[PDB]
Amino acid sequence: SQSNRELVVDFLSYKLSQKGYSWSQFSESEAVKQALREAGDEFELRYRRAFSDLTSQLHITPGTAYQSFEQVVNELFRDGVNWGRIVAFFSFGGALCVESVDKEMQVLVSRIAAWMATYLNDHLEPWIQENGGWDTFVELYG
Amino acid sequence: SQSNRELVVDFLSYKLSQKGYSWSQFSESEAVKQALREAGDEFELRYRRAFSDLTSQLHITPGTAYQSFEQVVNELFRDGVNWGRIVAFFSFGGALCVESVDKEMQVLVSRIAAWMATYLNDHLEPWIQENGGWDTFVELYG
Ligand SMILES: *S(=O)(=O)c1cc(C(=O)O)ccc1-c1ccc(F)cc1
Ligand SMILES: *S(=O)(=O)c1cc(C(=O)O)ccc1-c1ccc(F)cc1
Numbered sequence: 001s002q003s004n005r006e007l008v009v010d011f012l013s014y015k016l017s018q019k020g021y022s023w024s025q026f027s028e029s030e031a032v033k034q035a036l037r038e039a040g041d042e043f044e045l046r047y048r049r050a051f052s053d054l055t056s057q058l059h060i061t062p063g064t065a066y067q068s069f070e071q072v073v074n075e076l077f078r079d080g081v082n083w084g085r086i087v088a089f090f091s092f093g094g095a096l097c098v099e100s101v102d103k104e105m106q107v108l109v110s111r112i113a114a115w116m117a118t119y120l121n122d123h124l125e126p127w128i129q130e131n132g133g134w135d136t137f138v139e140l141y142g
Numbered sequence: 143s144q145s146n147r148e149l150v151v152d153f154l155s156y157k158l159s160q161k162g163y164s165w166s167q168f169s170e171s172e173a174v175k176q177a178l179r180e181a182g183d184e185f186e187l188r189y190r191r192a193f194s195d196l197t198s199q200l201h202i203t204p205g206t207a208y209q210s211f212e213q214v215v216n217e218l219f220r221d222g223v224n225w226g227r228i229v230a231f232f233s234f235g236g237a238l239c240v241e242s243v244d245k246e247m248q249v250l251v252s253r254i255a256a257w258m259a260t261y262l263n264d265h266l267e268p269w270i271q272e273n274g275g276w277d278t279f280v281e282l283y284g
């Protein structure tokens with residue numbers, strides 16, 4: 001896609017790495033990526049329980065449709081968009097990739113990356129642009 | 143206060159009662175009280191980890207100032223006010239009351255109720271009025 005696609009790929013590469021997997025076998029910009037990597041690790045520590053209940057709701061098979069992903073991701077934004085909720089979303093996507101590689105369905109990695117870039121573009125990009133862009137996120141979270 | 147104090151007391155009475163403690167031994171409107179009651183239970187269940195990190199932050203001794211409670215509660219509104227964070231606020235106060243009764247400092251329950259009411263008035267009331275009052279919380283969470 002574009003700059004959102006590039007952000008999704010960086011985050012998923014990091015999440016995969018933390019679990020010992022490489023992206024290569026599946027295929028302010030620096031400050032945005034670093035800040036989002038750090039924000040996702042923090043969110044994963046603080047909301048261990050609630051996050052586990054989220055990831056439980058979706059088990060990605062080669063048959064899962066994007067709409068099934070949207071329905072659970074939509075729960076994160078029920079009451080609107082915010083940075084914490086966008087971080088949760090990245091984290092969520094990262095956990096589905098890890099789960100995918102764990103179950104030897106490494107083909108779903110590029111599929112989740114596409115689903116995420118799409119979801120950011122369609123639903124989150126207007127609120128992001130309206131709230132200072134990714135540079136604001138960095139100034140707030142870096 | 144007013145509706146806020148009535149809301150605080152109902153919520154605190156409910157929480158204490160759940161653990162087997164009466165409010166009486168220390169001292170649409172129904173749809174709101176009920177909706178908040180249910181929200182507080184669901185919240186306490188969903189954020190097992192995160193809620194525990196917050197309650198840990200303040201251990202109320204009869205010499206704890208309001209400014210102390212306020213500083214830990216500002217942590218709940220760090221990145222803005224939303225219905226969910228207001229629900230976390232009520233749940234937190236409920237925990238500080240159950241904690242006071244259990245730690246033999248059952249006198250504190252009345253002061254917590256007063257701290258909660260003031261916080262709502264000084265900080266939370268404009269956001270509540272701007273987002274359609276408690277009837278909107280009901281018409282969403284109820
Ligand atoms: S949570 O209360 O932070 C929350 C709130 C919403 C909402 O729409 O109000 C959506 C999602 C979440 C959430 C936070 C943390 C998680 F691990 C999962 C969901
Ligand atoms: S979170 O636990 O970091 C958090 C963050 C904010 C914020 O404004 O950044 C507000 C509330 C919370 C929180 C949610 C749920 C809990 F049980 C405890 C804290």
Ligand SMILES: [Br-]
Nearest residue numbers: 047050191192
């Ligand atoms: Br949690």
